[PDB]
Structure formats: C-alpha cells, structure tokens
Amino acid sequence: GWEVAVRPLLSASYSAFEMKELPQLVASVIESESEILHHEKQYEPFYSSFVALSTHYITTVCSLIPRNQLQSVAAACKVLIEFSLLRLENPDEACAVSQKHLILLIKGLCTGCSRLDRTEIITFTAMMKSAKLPPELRQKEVQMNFLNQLTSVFNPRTDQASAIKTKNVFIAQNVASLQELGGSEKLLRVCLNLPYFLRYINRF
C-alpha cells in the first residue's frame, strides 16, 4: 500500500499527475498525516522525499482540480506546509530536504507555483526509490471526500480564467493554513536564526 502510493507518485514521475491518482495521493497523505508528523524513524529519507515530491506535484496541479478534489489538494498542502514548517523549525540531518528547498516548497504552495527544477525532482525521486520505507477502494475514497464536504463548508470567497481562480483559491488556502499553524512566525524565527545572518545581525 505504501508501495502502491509511492506508485501513483512515480507514475506521475512519469508524467504530470493524471489527477486520477491524485485522489489517491490526497488520501494517503491525509491518513498518513500522523505517520509523517513525528515518526522520528530511520525512515526519515523515505518520508521526507515523499513529502518533497508530494508537495511538488500537488503544486503542479493547482490550475485545475475537481472542486472536491480541489478541497482535497488544499488539505493535503496544508498538511505539507505544516510538515515543512516543522522541519525548518527542527533542522534534522536525517531529513533529506534542505531548509532552502523546504522554504521553496512552502513558497510554492503559497505562490501556486513550484520552483524546484527537474534535476532536484529527480534527486528526490531517486532518493525515494532508494529510500522506500527502507471498487471498495473508490468507495472509501468518496466516503472520505464526503465526510469532508460534510463537516467542512468551504467558501470560495472568490473557462480560461477558471484555472487561475482555482489557483487563487489554492493559494489562499495555503496562506490560511500557514497562519493557522502560525508558520509565519516560525519562519521569522528560522530567518533570524540563519547561520551566516547571525554574524551581521549582532554586528549591526
């Protein structure tokens, strides 16, 4: 199952998520939410490259997503931002995602654009492959997207420009999640805690 998940992931590695497996990725992340949070396990490489390309492809697909799968992607990216802020605040050598990339993945969700290059992506995919935890299904999927449409009444709060609107909504959602997490303040601390910055800071 974890295997089949890294699977629609790399099938997208093959090509931009068909958004047909996306409904599966959102699923995985949402449930594996706790696992990634504080596993603190040798799996670090695996879980971390997972988080990395996961953010990457969800960012790739913001222009167009199923309203409901839009909500799904939004939740997934909120989770992603949470984890990234966590990593930035808690720098770890075992983490296979650099704070520079981590911040870019966060800006990527906030900007509805992913900056990572193909080479970085491939490094991640490589690490992933190397570090892999080193009918009824559709039923559960919809039951879940339903428990979501039920308990959470999303407000758009505002066909060629529709994708832009979708991206805008996604962007706003990411920003909101960040504020909920207070990640902005966390980021501030990270910035003020830069290794080279400290020197000039004290001098100034």
Partner: protein, 238 residues
C-alpha cells in the same frame, strides 16, 4: 464632537418638525459640503500631524454625522408621511459625506506622519457613526415620530426595524459593512492562531483589535442590527 463622549449616537433631524426644518436646511447644506469637498481635494491636509490630524479627523467625522442625520431626516420624511429637488439635494449631501470620509481615511492611511493604529482608529470611529445611524433609521416608526410630535441608541436599547431604510440607507450601510470587514480582518490575524475597556471614540485612542470591536458591539446589538438590515433589504428588494 458632543457625541465622541460616548453619549450614544444622537442624530437630531428626527422630530417630524425637525425633519421639515432640515429639508428646509437641505439646499444650503449641499452648498457647504460641496465647498468643503472642493477645498480638501488640494494638499490642505498634507502634513497629518497629531495636532492637525485631530482637526482632519474632526471635519471627516463631521460630514459623516451630517450625512447620517440627513439620511435619518429623509427616513422620517418617508416614515412619517421642489420636493424632488430637496430629495436630490440630500442624496448629493450623503454621497459627498461618504466621499469626504473616504478621502480623509486614505490621507491618514498613506501619510508618513499618521496611519497604522491612527488609521485603524479613524476607521473604527467611522464604523461606529455609520452603525449607530443605521440603527436609528431602522428603528423609527410612524408611531414613534407622531408620539414625539434627538434619537438615542442607548434610549432605544433600554426601551427594548422595517421602514425608514431606503437607498441612502443602503449607502451608509454598504460603507459600514466595508469598515466592519476591515476591523474584523484585523481581529483575525491579531489573534494569530487564536492569538480591556471599549476603544475610546478618539483618533489617537490606543486600543487592541478586540477593543475596537467591543466598542462597536457595545454601541448596538450588532448581530441584531446586521440581521435586521439583511432581512429588511431582502424584503424591499422582493
């Protein structure tokens, strides 16, 4: 100015006779509001320094109140009872009233000697005035006017909707909604991740977000005013 002492909002054009007298005073008031707007378009208030800043806020809240009172007088006219000419005059008055409010607001906002909390407090005072005006115009009936023949939001509060509300009422109301939206968005972030006495009715008055909003909540049952306005508007549109 008498009102910035938390003496309730107390619009005066309210008795049937007072509204007749102000319709008489409508045309000449347009002349004054127009003159003031033309003057304050120049760099008249360029150096918004606390000192001057006080007077700049004074004039702005002044047309705000003049306009809200003209609106309340038109409300009495439509509830209790050259007429078209006077109606156009009062419409122009309320329009330029909101316009001057907006101008002084943007001046305090983009100023290098004013803004931030100062601008926030100007917004707070404007919202207070507008909401109190909305409440007064909403809760006036033929009955009350005839019985009178100087409304107090606190008077009505201790005593405790449709009619009076009209197109000028729509204007003041939309503006109040803008200002309330602003103050509430402030309160959100302020309580970043969930995170005193009511804000004083003064520009430089120092208060927390919660406080400005508490003063705006202690002046009018806010949920009530808002929902009443919703219902009334929907009905009138229907």
């Amino acid at each position: 100015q008498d009102a910035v002492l938390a003496n309730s909002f107390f619009i005066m054009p309210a008795t049937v006779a007072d509204a007749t007298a102000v319709r008489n005073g409508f045309h000449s008031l347009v002349i004054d509001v127009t003159m003031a707007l033309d003057t304050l378009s120049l760099p008249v208030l360029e150096p918004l320094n606390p000192s001057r800043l006080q007077d700049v806020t004074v004039l702005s809240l002044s047309c705000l109140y003049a306009g809200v009172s003209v609106a309340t007088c038109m409300a009495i006219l439509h509830v209790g009872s050259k007429e078209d000419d006077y109606e156009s005059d009062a419409a122009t008055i309320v329009q330029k009233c909101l316009e001057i409010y907006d101008m002084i607001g943007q001046a305090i906002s983009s100023s290098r000697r004013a803004g931030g909390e100062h601008y926030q407090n100007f917004q707070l005072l404007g919202a207070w005035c507008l909401l109190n005006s909305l409440f007064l115009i909403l809760n006036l009936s033929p009955t009350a006017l005839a019985d009178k023949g100087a409304l107090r939001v606190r008077d009505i509060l201790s005593r405790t909707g449709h009619q009076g509300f009209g197109v000028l009422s729509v204007i003041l109301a939309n503006h109040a909604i803008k200002l309330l939206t602003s103050l509430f968005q402030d309160l959100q972030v302020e309580a970043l991740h969930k995170g005193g006495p009511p804000a004083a009715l003064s520009i430089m008055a120092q208060s927390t977000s919660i406080q400005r909003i508490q003063r705006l909540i202690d002046s009018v049952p806010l949920m009530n005013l808002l929902l009443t306005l919703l219902s009334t508007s929907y009905r009138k549109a229907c």
